[PDB]
């Protein structure tokens, strides 16, 4: 069980990006990091599109897959700028 988990499974790419962008902006304002982005594995459509978005989000310090024990490739960890 975790804090700052964002549930994006079953969303469209556009909807998921919009939610992720809002969540990150919120986290930056509240000085909260890291975020756990729960997108699921599927055919990897959400993961790839959300990683693609994250490479240029102004608020992001870094991002990577979760550890194997904590969702792996179905979760992206976002380190938000402090």
- In the chain, where the domains are located: 1-82
DSSP symbol at 31: T
CATH architecture assigned to 1-82:
2-Layer Sandwich (3.30)
Q: How many CB atoms lie within 10 A of CB 75?
A: 20
- Experimental approach: X-ray
Cited resolution, angstroms:
1.2
Asked if residue 79 lies in contact with residue 33, where contact means CB atoms within 8 angstroms, the answer is yes
Please count the CA atoms within 13 angstroms of the CA of 74 that sit on its side-chain side. Answer: 10
CA 63 to chain centre: 8
Angle subtended at Cα 64 by Cα 40 and Cα 60, rounded to the nearest 5 degrees: 105
Buried/exposed code over 35-63 (b: 16+ C-beta within 10 A; e: otherwise): bbbbbbeeeeebbebbbebbeebebbeeb
8 A C-beta contact, residue 33 and residue 27:
yes
Taking a C-beta distance cutoff of 8 angstroms, is the pair 61, 81 a contact?
yes
Are 75 and 36 within 8 A, CB to CB?
yes
């Amino acid at each position: 069980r975790f804090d700052n988990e964002l549930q994006l499974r079953g969303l469209s790419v556009e909807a998921a990006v919009e939610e992720l962008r809002a969540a990150i902006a919120e986290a930056r304002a509240l000085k909260e990091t890291p975020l756990r982005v729960v997108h699921g594995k599927g055919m990897g459509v959400l993961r790839r599109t959300l990683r693609d978005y994250l490479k240029t989000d102004k608020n992001v310090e870094s991002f990577h897959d979760a550890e194997a024990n904590q969702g792996g490739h179905g979760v992206t960890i976002v380190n938000v700028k402090r």
